[PDB]
Amino acid sequence: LTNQCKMINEQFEPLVPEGRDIFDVWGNDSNYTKIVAAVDMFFHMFKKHECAS
Amino acid sequence: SVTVKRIIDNTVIVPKLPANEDPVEYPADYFRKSKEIPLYINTTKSLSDLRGYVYQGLKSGNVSIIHVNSYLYGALKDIRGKLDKDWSSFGINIGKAGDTIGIFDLVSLKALDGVLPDGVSDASRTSADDKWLPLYLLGLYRVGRTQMPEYRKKLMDGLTNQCKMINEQFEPLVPEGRDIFDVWGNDSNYTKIVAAVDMFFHMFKKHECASFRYGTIVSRFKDCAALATFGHLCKITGMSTEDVTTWILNREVADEMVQMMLPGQEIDKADSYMPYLIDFGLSSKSPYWSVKNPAFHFWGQLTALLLRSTRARNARQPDDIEYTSLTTAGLLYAYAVGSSADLAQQFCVGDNKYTPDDSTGGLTTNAPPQGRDVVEWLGWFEDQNRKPTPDMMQYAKRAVMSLQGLREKTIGKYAKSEFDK
Amino acid sequence: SVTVKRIIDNTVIVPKLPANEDPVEYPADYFRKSKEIPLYINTTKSLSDLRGYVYQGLKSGNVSIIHVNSYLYGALKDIRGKLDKDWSSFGINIGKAGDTIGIFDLVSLKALDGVLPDGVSDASRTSADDKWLPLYLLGLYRVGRTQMPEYRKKLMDGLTNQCKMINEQFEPLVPEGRDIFDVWGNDSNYTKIVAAVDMFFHMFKKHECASFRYGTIVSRFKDCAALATFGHLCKITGMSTEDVTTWILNREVADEMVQMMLPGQEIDKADSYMPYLIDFGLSSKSPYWSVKNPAFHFWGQLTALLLRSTRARNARQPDDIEYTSLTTAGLLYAYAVGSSADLAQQFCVGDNKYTPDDSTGGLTTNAPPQGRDVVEWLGWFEDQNRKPTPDMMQYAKRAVMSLQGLREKTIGKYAKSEFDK
Amino acid sequence: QPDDIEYTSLTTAGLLYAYAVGSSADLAQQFCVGDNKYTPDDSTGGLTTNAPP
Amino acid sequence: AVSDVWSLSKTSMTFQPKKASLQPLTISLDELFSSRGEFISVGGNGRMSHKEAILLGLRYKKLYNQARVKYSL
CATH code, domain carrying B291: 1.10.3610.10
Q: Which residues of C touch E (CB under 8 A)?
A: 356, 358-363, 365-366, 369, 375-376, 379-380, 382-385
Compute the C-alpha angle B73/B79/B82, nearest 5°.
145
Q: Which chain C residues contact residue D29 at CB under 8 A?
A: 7
Q: Which three-class secondary structure state does DSSP give residue B26?
A: coil
- Domain end point (choices C186, C218, C250): C218
Residue C256 shares a structural domain with residue C145: no
The domain in which residue C316 lies consists of 221-420
Nearest to B304 by CA among C116, D23, C321: C321
| Distance of alpha carbon B88 from alpha carbon B113, whole angstroms | 33
Judge contact between B8 and B77, C-beta under 8 A.
no
**What angle do helix axes C133-143 and C188-203 make, rounded to 10 degrees?**
110
Q: Which three-class secondary structure state does DSSP give residue C130?
A: coil
Q: Which residues pair with B316 in a beta bridge?
A: B410
Method: X-ray
Q: Do C7 and D32 touch (CB under 8 A)?
A: yes
Chosen from B242, B274, B406 to mutate, greatest number of chain C CBs within 10 A: B242
Residue C196 shares a structural domain with residue C124: yes
**Residues sharing a CB contact under 8 Å with residue C354, sequence separation 6 or more, in sequence order:** none
Residue B209 shares a structural domain with residue B285: no
**Residues sharing a CB contact under 8 Å with residue B400, sequence separation 6 or more, in sequence order:** B305, B306, B412, B415, B416, B418, B419, B420
| Distance of alpha carbon B197 from alpha carbon B76, whole angstroms | 9
Q: Radius of gyration (Cα) for chain D, nearest Å?
A: 18
Task: Estimate to the nearest angstrom the gap between the alpha carbon of C346 and the chain centroid.
Answer: 35
Q: Is residue B11 part of a domain?
A: no
Residue B213 shares a structural domain with residue B231: no
Q: Is residue C28 part of a domain?
A: no
| Distance of alpha carbon E16 from alpha carbon E14, whole angstroms | 7
Q: Is residue B322 part of a domain?
A: yes
Q: Which chain C residues contact residue E61 at CB under 8 A?
A: 365-366
* Total domains, chain E: 1
Q: Is residue C9 part of a domain?
A: no
E strand spans, C14-164? 39-40, 80-82, 87-89, 92-95, 100-102, 108-109
Chosen from B363, B365, B366, B370 to mutate, greatest number of chain E CBs within 10 A: B363
Give the number of other Cβ atoms within 10 Å of residue C357's Cβ.
Answer: 5
| Distance of alpha carbon B116 from alpha carbon B124, whole angstroms | 23
Compute the C-alpha angle B124/B127/B132, nearest 5°.
105
Q: Do C17 and B241 touch (CB under 8 A)?
A: yes
Task: Estimate to the nearest angstrom the gap between the alpha carbon of C8 and the chain centroid.
Answer: 53
Nearest-Cα distance to chain B for A34, in Å, is 21
Nearest Cα residue in chain E from C356: E21
Q: Which chain D residues contact residue C9 at CB under 8 A?
A: none
Residue B402 DSSP label: T
Q: Is residue C320 part of a domain?
A: yes
Phi-psi region of B90 (alpha: psi -120 to 50; beta: other; left: phi over 0): left
- Domain end point (choices B218, B233, B263): B218
| Distance of alpha carbon C209 from alpha carbon B266, whole angstroms | 59
Residue B112 DSSP label: P
| Distance of alpha carbon B292 from alpha carbon C344, whole angstroms | 65
**Residues sharing a CB contact under 8 Å with residue C362, sequence separation 6 or more, in sequence order:** E23, E25, E26, E27
| Distance of alpha carbon C187 from alpha carbon C104, whole angstroms | 17
| Distance of alpha carbon C198 from alpha carbon C192, whole angstroms | 10
Give the number of other Cβ atoms within 10 Å of residue E2's Cβ.
Answer: 9
* Total domains, chain B: 2
Residue B334 shares a structural domain with residue B385: yes
Residue C167 shares a structural domain with residue C58: yes
Residue C249 DSSP label: -
Q: Which residues pair with E67 in a beta bridge?
A: none
| Distance of alpha carbon B54 from alpha carbon B121, whole angstroms | 8
The H or E element spanning position A7 is none
Residue C369 shares a structural domain with residue C350: yes
Residue C311 shares a structural domain with residue C392: yes
| Distance of alpha carbon B303 from alpha carbon B329, whole angstroms | 9
Nearest to C272 by CA among C19, C414, C129, C91: C91
CATH number at residue E64: 1.10.8.440
Residue C128 shares a structural domain with residue C260: no
Nearest-Cα distance to chain A for B186, in Å, is 7
Helices (H), B75-224: 133-145, 188-203
Neighbours of chain A (3+ CB pairs under 8 A): B
Resolution (Å units): 2.7
Q: Which three-class secondary structure state does DSSP give residue C5?
A: strand
The domain in which residue E65 lies consists of 1-73
> Residue C181: what residue type?
F
| Distance of alpha carbon C303 from alpha carbon C233, whole angstroms | 8
**What angle do helix axes B225-237 and B294-306 make, rounded to 10 degrees?**
30
Judge contact between C214 and C299, C-beta under 8 A.
no
HEC-encoded secondary structure of chain E: CCCCCHHHHHCCEEECECCCCCCCEEECHHHHCCCCHHHHHHCCCCCCCHHHHHHHHCCCCCCCHHHHHHECC
> Residue B83: what residue type?
L
| Distance of alpha carbon B81 from alpha carbon B203, whole angstroms | 9
Of B246, B250, B386, the CB nearest to D24: B386
Residue C212 shares a structural domain with residue C231: no
- Is A47 within any annotated ligand binding site? yes
| Distance of alpha carbon C7 from alpha carbon C21, whole angstroms | 33
- Is C409 within any annotated ligand binding site? no
- The dihedral through the CA atoms of E57, E61, E62, E68 has a sign that is negative
CATH number at residue C210: 1.10.3570.10
Residue C276 φ/ψ, nearest 5 degrees? -140, 30
The burial class, CB within 10 Å (0-12 / 13-18 / 19+), for B347 is middle
| Distance of alpha carbon C140 from alpha carbon B251, whole angstroms | 59
Q: Which residues pair with E15 in a beta bridge?
A: E25
Q: Is residue C13 part of a domain?
A: no
Nearest-Cα distance to chain E for B372, in Å, is 22
| Distance of alpha carbon E54 from alpha carbon E60, whole angstroms | 11
Q: Do D37 and B253 touch (CB under 8 A)?
A: no
Neighbours of chain C (3+ CB pairs under 8 A): B, D, E
Q: Which three-class secondary structure state does DSSP give residue B24?
A: coil
Residue C197 shares a structural domain with residue C247: no
| Distance of alpha carbon C392 from alpha carbon C371, whole angstroms | 16
**Residues sharing a CB contact under 8 Å with residue B270, sequence separation 6 or more, in sequence order:** B202, C19, C21
Residue B171 DSSP label: -
- Domain end point (choices C218, C237, C253): C218
Of A6, A8, A10, the CB nearest to B186: A6
DSSP string, D13-24: HHHHHHHHHHHS
Q: Which three-class secondary structure state does DSSP give residue B77?
A: coil
Residue B369 DSSP label: P
Q: Which residues of B touch A (CB under 8 A)?
A: 61, 116, 179-180, 182-183, 186-187
Residue B273 shares a structural domain with residue B199: no
Q: Which residues pair with B4 in a beta bridge?
A: B13
> Residue B37: what residue type?
I
Q: Which three-class secondary structure state does DSSP give residue C93?
A: strand
Helices (H), C238-322: 241-246, 251-260, 294-306
- The dihedral through the CA atoms of C109, C115, C118, C120 has a sign that is negative
Residue C172 DSSP label: S
> Residue B345: what residue type?
Q
- The dihedral through the CA atoms of B338, B244, B20, B314 has a sign that is positive
Phi-psi region of C217 (alpha: psi -120 to 50; beta: other; left: phi over 0): alpha
Q: Is residue C386 part of a domain?
A: yes
